[PDB]
Amino acid sequence: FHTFFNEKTFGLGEADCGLRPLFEKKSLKDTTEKELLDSYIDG
């Protein structure tokens, strides 16, 4: 990833944002992800 904010002005989280505990961390996809991931035709 890439720390953009300053850990002390921003707060904790920056380095692990966007990763849900009940899915990503667990390698579990949610009901509708595929509908989104499949829409990213971009290379």
Partner: protein, 258 residues
Amino acid sequence: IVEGWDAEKGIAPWQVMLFRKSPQELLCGASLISDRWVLTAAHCILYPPWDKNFTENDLLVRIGKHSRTRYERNVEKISMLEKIYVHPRYNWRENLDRDIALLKLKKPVPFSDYIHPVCLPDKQTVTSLLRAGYKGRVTGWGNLRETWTTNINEIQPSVLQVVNLPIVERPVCKASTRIRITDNMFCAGFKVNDTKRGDACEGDAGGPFVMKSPFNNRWYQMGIVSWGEGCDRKGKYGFYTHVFRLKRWIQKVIDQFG
């Protein structure tokens, strides 16, 4: 959210509720970009046309909720607001340009399985995901439909809704309304004008418009539920605050704590 569905628990740990203290009232939605900062729509905080001018004390935020009403203890965490930072060049009089604001939680909030911050995009992620056709996601406890079968004000969900919407080309977004849209907002919905339906309605403001980068597997908040005419209106698209464009501002504020 209209045409959406029940969100699996912990589907959006960042989703937040902007709660008015007295009287208690669920105002808008919000996000968690950090344990000290909450992002939400500016008009949720300031809107003269409706005698709407809240301050740090008038309200607070509830994080990690699922139910639109009960107090899910041992899960959701309440937090008092320390300072509200609504974008200066916010324009509540004309087109609601730059609808955005930052919320500084008095005391940092503890993370968990149901509360985890969302990621702010970067020039690189935006350019590749924020394009016409690419679908994004939105979540909130807003109205399930634009209208009211009036003898029944029950169109408000019992649990956090979630709808997947695709982004619409700028020109179309422009044509869709007489209102003057800017490069500080983008719209999404369906033209297909049948296929699937769905949009955010009253009460989804501040709600995040997120996308999961197929590259690093993380969720990014491209927009903020701002405005729209009607809800799920054919030939009509929703409008969210372009988050990446106000990154600069966000940066400024956080770095100088306002």
